[PDB]
C-alpha cells in the first residue's frame, strides 16, 4: 500500500516522528518491500538506533527474513551497528539465523570485521561450528578476509 511504502521509506531515512505518525494511521509495522525487507530491516541496516527501538516497542517482527534470508540481526552485524545488535538480541533475535547461503550473523560480523559484535554474538550463543554453503565457519571467513583479531578470538574457542 501507499502507507506501507511511506513507512519503509521513513524507517530507511531515519524519520522518527514520521514512522510513529504513519503507524498510528495504520501502516503495517511488518510491511515488505520488493526485496522482502521490513521497516526494522531498513532501520537496523542504516544504523538508526532509536527507530529500531520504536519499531520493536510497537510490534515489529524481530526475526523477519528478507528474500535472501537475512534478518535485521544479520544486517546490523554485517554493517557494524553494535548497539542495534544488542537491542535486537534483547528483543529475541535468533542469534543463529541462517540466510540463503547459510550465513549466520557471526559469519557476517567475521566477513566485514566487527570484533566487538563477534564477542556479543558469542556471548549470546552464536554457534562457532556453523558452516555456510561455501563450507566456511566464521573463523574461516575471518582468516580468509584478513581479520586477524577476530580469527585469534575464535581460535581460543574450539
PDB file of C-alpha atoms in Angstrom:
ATOM      1  CA  UNK A   1       0.000   0.000   0.000  1.00  0.00           C
ATOM      2  CA  UNK A   2       0.866   3.711  -0.184  1.00  0.00           C
ATOM      3  CA  UNK A   3       1.151   3.977   3.623  1.00  0.00           C
ATOM      4  CA  UNK A   4       3.323   0.861   3.816  1.00  0.00           C
ATOM      5  CA  UNK A   5       5.708   2.306   1.203  1.00  0.00           C
ATOM      6  CA  UNK A   6       5.918   5.587   3.141  1.00  0.00           C
ATOM      7  CA  UNK A   7       6.710   3.697   6.373  1.00  0.00           C
ATOM      8  CA  UNK A   8       9.506   1.703   4.717  1.00  0.00           C
ATOM      9  CA  UNK A   9      10.926   4.990   3.398  1.00  0.00           C
ATOM     10  CA  UNK A  10      10.653   6.776   6.771  1.00  0.00           C
ATOM     11  CA  UNK A  11      12.398   3.898   8.587  1.00  0.00           C
ATOM     12  CA  UNK A  12      15.200   3.794   5.993  1.00  0.00           C
ATOM     13  CA  UNK A  13      15.588   7.602   6.136  1.00  0.00           C
ATOM     14  CA  UNK A  14      15.637   7.728   9.955  1.00  0.00           C
ATOM     15  CA  UNK A  15      12.490   9.868  10.338  1.00  0.00           C
ATOM     16  CA  UNK A  16      11.239   9.018  13.845  1.00  0.00           C
ATOM     17  CA  UNK A  17       8.106  11.176  14.038  1.00  0.00           C
ATOM     18  CA  UNK A  18       7.089  10.077  10.537  1.00  0.00           C
ATOM     19  CA  UNK A  19       7.429   6.395  11.499  1.00  0.00           C
ATOM     20  CA  UNK A  20       5.164   6.990  14.522  1.00  0.00           C
ATOM     21  CA  UNK A  21       2.535   9.010  12.629  1.00  0.00           C
ATOM     22  CA  UNK A  22       2.392   6.552   9.731  1.00  0.00           C
ATOM     23  CA  UNK A  23       1.951   3.580  12.075  1.00  0.00           C
ATOM     24  CA  UNK A  24      -0.751   5.427  14.044  1.00  0.00           C
ATOM     25  CA  UNK A  25      -2.577   5.797  10.703  1.00  0.00           C
ATOM     26  CA  UNK A  26      -2.465   2.031  10.036  1.00  0.00           C
ATOM     27  CA  UNK A  27       0.824   1.405   8.212  1.00  0.00           C
ATOM     28  CA  UNK A  28       1.878  -2.233   8.686  1.00  0.00           C
ATOM     29  CA  UNK A  29       4.896  -2.390  11.027  1.00  0.00           C
ATOM     30  CA  UNK A  30       5.861  -5.568   9.166  1.00  0.00           C
ATOM     31  CA  UNK A  31       5.332  -4.174   5.639  1.00  0.00           C
ATOM     32  CA  UNK A  32       7.533  -5.757   2.962  1.00  0.00           C
ATOM     33  CA  UNK A  33       9.356  -4.072   0.088  1.00  0.00           C
ATOM     34  CA  UNK A  34      10.343  -5.746  -3.219  1.00  0.00           C
ATOM     35  CA  UNK A  35      13.431  -7.245  -1.508  1.00  0.00           C
ATOM     36  CA  UNK A  36      11.308  -8.643   1.342  1.00  0.00           C
ATOM     37  CA  UNK A  37      12.718  -6.031   3.761  1.00  0.00           C
ATOM     38  CA  UNK A  38      10.637  -4.762   6.680  1.00  0.00           C
ATOM     39  CA  UNK A  39      10.947  -1.300   8.279  1.00  0.00           C
ATOM     40  CA  UNK A  40      13.032  -2.962  11.028  1.00  0.00           C
ATOM     41  CA  UNK A  41      15.448  -4.404   8.430  1.00  0.00           C
ATOM     42  CA  UNK A  42      15.934  -0.938   6.979  1.00  0.00           C
ATOM     43  CA  UNK A  43      16.392   0.893  10.288  1.00  0.00           C
ATOM     44  CA  UNK A  44      18.770  -1.821  11.539  1.00  0.00           C
ATOM     45  CA  UNK A  45      20.798  -1.773   8.313  1.00  0.00           C
ATOM     46  CA  UNK A  46      21.074   2.030   8.260  1.00  0.00           C
ATOM     47  CA  UNK A  47      22.047   2.250  11.934  1.00  0.00           C
ATOM     48  CA  UNK A  48      19.019   4.218  13.175  1.00  0.00           C
ATOM     49  CA  UNK A  49      19.097   3.110  16.822  1.00  0.00           C
ATOM     50  CA  UNK A  50      16.094   4.954  18.210  1.00  0.00           C
ATOM     51  CA  UNK A  51      13.901   3.902  15.268  1.00  0.00           C
ATOM     52  CA  UNK A  52      14.924   0.262  15.829  1.00  0.00           C
ATOM     53  CA  UNK A  53      13.759   0.708  19.437  1.00  0.00           C
ATOM     54  CA  UNK A  54      10.494   2.390  18.373  1.00  0.00           C
ATOM     55  CA  UNK A  55       9.679  -0.327  15.832  1.00  0.00           C
ATOM     56  CA  UNK A  56      10.332  -3.114  18.362  1.00  0.00           C
ATOM     57  CA  UNK A  57       8.270  -1.340  21.061  1.00  0.00           C
ATOM     58  CA  UNK A  58       5.363  -1.082  18.618  1.00  0.00           C
ATOM     59  CA  UNK A  59       5.263  -4.680  17.431  1.00  0.00           C
ATOM     60  CA  UNK A  60       7.927  -5.270  14.747  1.00  0.00           C
ATOM     61  CA  UNK A  61       8.835  -8.892  13.994  1.00  0.00           C
ATOM     62  CA  UNK A  62      12.405  -9.153  15.292  1.00  0.00           C
ATOM     63  CA  UNK A  63      13.071 -12.283  13.207  1.00  0.00           C
ATOM     64  CA  UNK A  64      11.563 -11.222   9.854  1.00  0.00           C
ATOM     65  CA  UNK A  65      13.640 -12.581   6.943  1.00  0.00           C
ATOM     66  CA  UNK A  66      14.028 -10.850   3.565  1.00  0.00           C
ATOM     67  CA  UNK A  67      14.149 -12.539   0.134  1.00  0.00           C
ATOM     68  CA  UNK A  68      17.734 -13.711   0.680  1.00  0.00           C
ATOM     69  CA  UNK A  69      17.006 -14.911   4.226  1.00  0.00           C
ATOM     70  CA  UNK A  70      18.639 -12.037   6.121  1.00  0.00           C
ATOM     71  CA  UNK A  71      17.139 -10.897   9.408  1.00  0.00           C
ATOM     72  CA  UNK A  72      17.609  -7.434  10.949  1.00  0.00           C
ATOM     73  CA  UNK A  73      20.316  -9.005  13.140  1.00  0.00           C
ATOM     74  CA  UNK A  74      22.214 -10.211  10.052  1.00  0.00           C
ATOM     75  CA  UNK A  75      22.156  -6.671   8.663  1.00  0.00           C
ATOM     76  CA  UNK A  76      23.240  -4.925  11.865  1.00  0.00           C
ATOM     77  CA  UNK A  77      26.037  -7.493  12.353  1.00  0.00           C
ATOM     78  CA  UNK A  78      27.189  -7.022   8.745  1.00  0.00           C
ATOM     79  CA  UNK A  79      27.189  -3.199   8.797  1.00  0.00           C
ATOM     80  CA  UNK A  80      28.673  -2.981  12.293  1.00  0.00           C
ATOM     81  CA  UNK A  81      25.909  -1.416  14.399  1.00  0.00           C
ATOM     82  CA  UNK A  82      26.787  -2.772  17.841  1.00  0.00           C
ATOM     83  CA  UNK A  83      24.079  -1.124  19.944  1.00  0.00           C
ATOM     84  CA  UNK A  84      21.442  -2.268  17.444  1.00  0.00           C
ATOM     85  CA  UNK A  85      22.810  -5.848  17.627  1.00  0.00           C
ATOM     86  CA  UNK A  86      22.424  -5.696  21.423  1.00  0.00           C
ATOM     87  CA  UNK A  87      18.847  -4.367  21.301  1.00  0.00           C
ATOM     88  CA  UNK A  88      17.773  -6.908  18.666  1.00  0.00           C
ATOM     89  CA  UNK A  89      19.127  -9.724  20.839  1.00  0.00           C
ATOM     90  CA  UNK A  90      17.286  -8.309  23.888  1.00  0.00           C
ATOM     91  CA  UNK A  91      14.036  -8.472  21.871  1.00  0.00           C
ATOM     92  CA  UNK A  92      14.614 -12.143  20.981  1.00  0.00           C
ATOM     93  CA  UNK A  93      16.549 -12.073  17.697  1.00  0.00           C
ATOM     94  CA  UNK A  94      17.700 -15.550  16.669  1.00  0.00           C
ATOM     95  CA  UNK A  95      21.471 -15.416  17.146  1.00  0.00           C
ATOM     96  CA  UNK A  96      21.941 -18.372  14.754  1.00  0.00           C
ATOM     97  CA  UNK A  97      19.531 -17.344  11.956  1.00  0.00           C
ATOM     98  CA  UNK A  98      20.757 -18.707   8.612  1.00  0.00           C
ATOM     99  CA  UNK A  99      20.328 -16.858   5.288  1.00  0.00           C
ATOM    100  CA  UNK A 100      20.122 -18.152   1.665  1.00  0.00           C
ATOM    101  CA  UNK A 101      23.756 -19.383   1.658  1.00  0.00           C
ATOM    102  CA  UNK A 102      23.802 -20.420   5.335  1.00  0.00           C
ATOM    103  CA  UNK A 103      25.463 -17.285   6.698  1.00  0.00           C
ATOM    104  CA  UNK A 104      24.728 -16.616  10.346  1.00  0.00           C
ATOM    105  CA  UNK A 105      25.152 -13.183  11.956  1.00  0.00           C
ATOM    106  CA  UNK A 106      28.533 -14.394  13.246  1.00  0.00           C
ATOM    107  CA  UNK A 107      29.635 -15.244   9.687  1.00  0.00           C
ATOM    108  CA  UNK A 108      28.734 -11.699   8.602  1.00  0.00           C
ATOM    109  CA  UNK A 109      30.491  -9.972  11.517  1.00  0.00           C
ATOM    110  CA  UNK A 110      33.559 -12.089  10.690  1.00  0.00           C
ATOM    111  CA  UNK A 111      33.263 -11.153   6.992  1.00  0.00           C
ATOM    112  CA  UNK A 112      33.234  -7.375   7.455  1.00  0.00           C
ATOM    113  CA  UNK A 113      35.472  -7.390  10.550  1.00  0.00           C
ATOM    114  CA  UNK A 114      33.484  -6.273  13.601  1.00  0.00           C
ATOM    115  CA  UNK A 115      35.270  -7.603  16.696  1.00  0.00           C
ATOM    116  CA  UNK A 116      33.004  -6.222  19.412  1.00  0.00           C
ATOM    117  CA  UNK A 117      29.951  -7.596  17.578  1.00  0.00           C
ATOM    118  CA  UNK A 118      31.640 -11.008  17.269  1.00  0.00           C
ATOM    119  CA  UNK A 119      32.064 -11.001  21.058  1.00  0.00           C
ATOM    120  CA  UNK A 120      28.429 -10.039  21.707  1.00  0.00           C
ATOM    121  CA  UNK A 121      27.191 -12.764  19.354  1.00  0.00           C
ATOM    122  CA  UNK A 122      29.430 -15.363  21.038  1.00  0.00           C
ATOM    123  CA  UNK A 123      28.190 -14.407  24.487  1.00  0.00           C
ATOM    124  CA  UNK A 124      24.596 -14.889  23.229  1.00  0.00           C
ATOM    125  CA  UNK A 125      25.228 -18.410  21.956  1.00  0.00           C
ATOM    126  CA  UNK A 126      26.366 -17.993  18.351  1.00  0.00           C
ATOM    127  CA  UNK A 127      27.485 -21.369  17.001  1.00  0.00           C
ATOM    128  CA  UNK A 128      31.188 -21.275  16.104  1.00  0.00           C
ATOM    129  CA  UNK A 129      30.835 -24.579  14.180  1.00  0.00           C
ATOM    130  CA  UNK A 130      28.175 -23.274  11.800  1.00  0.00           C
ATOM    131  CA  UNK A 131      29.184 -23.901   8.182  1.00  0.00           C
ATOM    132  CA  UNK A 132      27.781 -21.864   5.313  1.00  0.00           C
ATOM    133  CA  UNK A 133      27.131 -23.218   1.790  1.00  0.00           C
ATOM    134  CA  UNK A 134      30.743 -22.353   0.892  1.00  0.00           C
ATOM    135  CA  UNK A 135      31.918 -24.748   3.642  1.00  0.00           C
ATOM    136  CA  UNK A 136      33.114 -21.880   5.843  1.00  0.00           C
ATOM    137  CA  UNK A 137      32.881 -21.378   9.575  1.00  0.00           C
ATOM    138  CA  UNK A 138      33.044 -17.783  10.868  1.00  0.00           C
ATOM    139  CA  UNK A 139      36.706 -18.423  11.802  1.00  0.00           C
ATOM    140  CA  UNK A 140      37.424 -19.481   8.210  1.00  0.00           C
ATOM    141  CA  UNK A 141      35.850 -16.269   6.902  1.00  0.00           C
ATOM    142  CA  UNK A 142      37.813 -14.081   9.357  1.00  0.00           C
ATOM    143  CA  UNK A 143      41.094 -15.722   8.303  1.00  0.00           C
ATOM    144  CA  UNK A 144      40.196 -15.550   4.594  1.00  0.00           C
ATOM    145  CA  UNK A 145      39.410 -11.828   4.830  1.00  0.00           C
ATOM    146  CA  UNK A 146      42.485 -10.839   6.842  1.00  0.00           C
ATOM    147  CA  UNK A 147      40.670 -10.091  10.099  1.00  0.00           C
ATOM    148  CA  UNK A 148      43.390 -11.476  12.346  1.00  0.00           C
ATOM    149  CA  UNK A 149      41.982 -10.112  15.635  1.00  0.00           C
ATOM    150  CA  UNK A 150      38.715 -11.995  15.070  1.00  0.00           C
ATOM    151  CA  UNK A 151      40.433 -15.176  13.869  1.00  0.00           C
ATOM    152  CA  UNK A 152      42.532 -15.103  17.089  1.00  0.00           C
ATOM    153  CA  UNK A 153      39.426 -14.764  19.284  1.00  0.00           C
ATOM    154  CA  UNK A 154      37.630 -17.631  17.528  1.00  0.00           C
ATOM    155  CA  UNK A 155      40.696 -19.910  17.716  1.00  0.00           C
ATOM    156  CA  UNK A 156      40.537 -19.933  21.539  1.00  0.00           C
ATOM    157  CA  UNK A 157      37.055 -21.464  21.497  1.00  0.00           C
ATOM    158  CA  UNK A 158      37.377 -24.862  19.833  1.00  0.00           C
TER     159      UNK A 158
END
